[model samples]
Target chain A: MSYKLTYFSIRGLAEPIRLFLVDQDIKFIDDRIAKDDFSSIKSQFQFGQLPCLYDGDQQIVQSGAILRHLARKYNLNGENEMETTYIDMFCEGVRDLHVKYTRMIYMAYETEKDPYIKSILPGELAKFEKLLATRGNGRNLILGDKISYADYALFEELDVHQILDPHCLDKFPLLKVFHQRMKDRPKLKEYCEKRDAAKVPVNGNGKQ
Target chain B: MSYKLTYFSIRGLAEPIRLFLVDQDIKFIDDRIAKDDFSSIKSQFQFGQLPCLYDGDQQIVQSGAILRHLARKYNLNGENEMETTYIDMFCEGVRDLHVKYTRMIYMAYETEKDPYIKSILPGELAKFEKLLATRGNGRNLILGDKISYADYALFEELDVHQILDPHCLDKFPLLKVFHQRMKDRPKLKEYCEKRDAAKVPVNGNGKQ
Candidate 1:
């Protein structure tokens, strides 16, 4: 069946899924809404949240669940149940930091943003750096050779952070390399270039 | 293999898993830590977060991942993939409210707490109320016939709110019943009794 992703025409929660679907060669409709149009259509989504997915006939919301659902669909979860659990753990870590980034972007005042961002950014990035460093010899991608959805999940977070602060990756060398390694992969590279040409002002002006 | 759950000695993040384990009749070691001792042992946890699970030898962190892992382990995820996806969506909606509850309970100043709580609690609870009403007839569990981990997660959140605001669930009749029904379930009822006897001040004073 066909797939359709419904979200504002911005790379807020949907971007990571977009990147991964493209990287895996999965094709579907990217049904992004304009800001002016989202309010009118918001009620169509369960719980009134965007980035909903229509997999054939069933509708799904919640980006985390959707990402994992896609990971399972494409066999990008991991090799085994245990690995998948590990991958889940890793993805949650990235999400924790992303929550902070999102909060800083959307809720924090101009004066509050710097402290919140500074307080969370390095410390959270360091945990990820330490995660990759201890596993797969510090040079492998986010999780390992498998390139599960966790990698793309984190890539989106780091991608946003770098855009917010061009040198955001400077301190976390391993993460910096991991970001590069992911973008350089063949299909992802192509998708990234094409996506850049069409990219809009990020949601919440990147706070989202 | 034995399961060991590490977290503060409170019914906070780890409590839902605790209740689930008890409901499912799984035996585990509840490794609850005291506030004074957390610092010395904090580093032992990956990412320095509690609610880490040592399933035999592997250490798994992230409450969401851990809950999903347990759900998978016990066949509590759902009957099929679609059910599981819906479960995940429900769980994320609960988390959206839980995060705000956490901020209000632990971090927000007195002035900040009331406004924040006023602004989001009603709307968020309404969303869950709508979800349960539409999907589960408003009387059945959160996800309907089969009880999934999402029910437990949301139950714990509602439970906390009712404690914080005695009449918090008064407006949402469905959720009020959902909370009571979950509490009245035989195994869960027994677990709640035992849990209350052992209840300590909730971690972050129950913001978790």
Candidate 2:
């Protein structure tokens, strides 16, 4: 099964999918489009957005949809429908924080950074910490013993938060351990280390 | 199975779930809370957000997650995983437009209304039009023969757009047909007629 992921040079929305592919040992074309060149080829995408996945003849748009597609195909979503629902819910929670993180990085990093670090970050991360403390398996994963796609997505969100503030995870011990657990995956650890050294900006506007 | 949907007394995020339940003839508690009452009970919720779903003892937060939970239980997501992926992509596209619509309604209605009507509405709606034209089944649904949860979410979005501007859908014939088709569902038609008479605002802020 040939796969191709098309996105900008940044690790913004596509990084989780990239990490998931690496974890599963899937080979695919990492098609990075220069922002300048995107406009010329924008008409080809379904919604004219990046992080589109092309699986052989079929093309999938939307980062969440693309991630779920991979998860469903690879048996990484969950053990059953109910678990998949919770996995999706956890990912959506991560998405909520990621949206605010994006807004801060691109639009208000200079002024909102302090408020984000103080109020917004903790307020949002606390919910995840609570979920981990209550709902998580004894393993450091979000749901069951098996690591689902939400783990990858959440790890990316927390990893980016660490970049924004080195001590960001100090307050949440469970998340701190969970973040390290995801990072310590042999394939993901190798992939992230090399990817980090490449210095790809977390977002398109080059803030963090 | 006992089901309860809790949200503000508006058609904001919970409308689609309500409509889906009504269409499926599922009896669920339509628990509406006033904004003033939410803070006192905020600690009871996982994310401290409304539009939560209580299925027996399981509490689901996040509107998308809640909707998908119902969809999974009732077989409204899709016939298979791939179709569900497509359905989710379409719903996410509707969500993108919904977010912009929300910002316009609550944040900048008076100043930004004209620009939204001229550029943003058409720009976003055209993508759906193109999708329906190219990808839809002859049944005027977003996916296969059956109506998925995405159709309900998309229907609410288009319904709200019609409220914003009566002439908004004049250009997209397929979407126009699709919108009318969803409105014409027997149970939904009855529910909406009664719902329209309730005089509930479309949002908590009372903008739309």
Taking the tens digit of each residue's C-alpha lDDT, what string does model 2 give over A65-137?
8998899899888897778888888899899899999989988999999899998898888888887765544
lDDT of 2 by residue, B60-91 (tens): 88898888889889888788777888898888
Docking class of 1: medium
- Best candidate, lDDT-wise? 2
lDDT of 1 by residue, B65-183 (tens): 99999999888898888888888988988887877777777776466666755777778888888888866687888667788898898888898877767777889999999998898
Scoring model 2 with DockQ, what do you get? Answer: 0.76
How do the residues A1-208 of candidate 1 rate in per-residue lDDT, one tens digit apiece?
3988888777888988888888888888999777788778777787887888899988889999899899888889888778889889989988888777777777764666667557767777888888877568768865566788988988888887887778778988899999898889899898778877876545656442
lDDT for B102 in candidate 1 is 76
Give TM-scores for every candidate, taking all chains together and pairing residue i with residue i: 0.91, 0.97
lDDT of each: 0.82, 0.88
Worst 10 residues of 1 chain B by lDDT: B199-208
Off by over 4 Å in 2: A136-139, B136-139
- The true-versus-predicted C-alpha distance at residue B99 of model 1, in Å, is 0.9
